[PDB]
C-alpha cells in the first residue's frame, strides 16, 4: 500500500505515458552501480587486456 492518495489518474486528465516513462527512467537510474579495477600481487600478473 504505497498509493495512499486518490489522485485522479483519468487518461484524458492525466499524462499517463510521460509518468510511465519518467518512472521507468527513475528505475533505470536506481539500477546504477559502482565498480573499480582489481589489483593482484603476483610476479607473472600484469594488468593488461587480452590483445595486450
Amino acid at each position: 500500500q504505497v498509493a495512499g492518495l486518490n489522485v485522479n489518474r483519468n487518461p484524458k486528465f492525466w499524462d499517463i505515458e510521460s509518468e510511465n516513462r519518467d518512472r521507468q527512467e527513475e528505475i533505470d537510474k536506481q539500477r546504477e552501480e559502482s565498480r573499480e579495477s582489481r589489483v593482484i600481487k603476483h610476479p607473472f600478473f600484469h594488468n593488461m587486456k587480452s590483445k595486450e
Binding site: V39, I40, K41, H42
Partner: protein
C-alpha cells in the same frame, strides 16, 4: 627555490631509525584507516606487521622530505632509501 634537484642530493642514502619509525607508524595508521595495501598479505592482520612487510618489499608509497638547517629540503622516496 627551496627544493634541491635529485642529481645533487647530498644527504645519506640510508633510512635512519627515526624515519623508519615514523614511516611505519604513518603507514600502519593509514592501513588501519582502510587504505589500499600494495603487498600480498598471507594471513597477517596487524597493521604494523603489514606496514613492516610493505617496507621490506619497498612498496610504501610515501616520500620523506629532509630539512636542511638553512631551510632547503631534499625529497627522498621510501623505495630509493636503503633499509636494513
Amino acid at each position: 627555490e627551496l627544493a634541491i634537484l635529485k642529481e645533487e642530493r647530498t644527504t645519506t642514502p640510508y633510512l635512519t631509525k627515526y624515519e623508519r619509525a615514523r614511516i611505519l607508524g604513518t603507514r600502519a595508521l593509514q592501513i588501519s584507516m582502510n587504505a589500499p595495501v600494495l603487498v600480498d598479505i598471507e594471513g597477517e592482520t596487524d597493521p604494523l606487521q603489514i606496514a613492516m612487510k610493505e617496507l621490506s618489499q619497498r612498496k610504501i608509497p610515501l616520500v620523506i622530505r629532509r630539512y636542511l638547517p638553512d631551510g632547503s629540503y631534499e625529497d627522498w622516496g621510501c623505495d630509493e632509501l636503503i633499509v636494513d
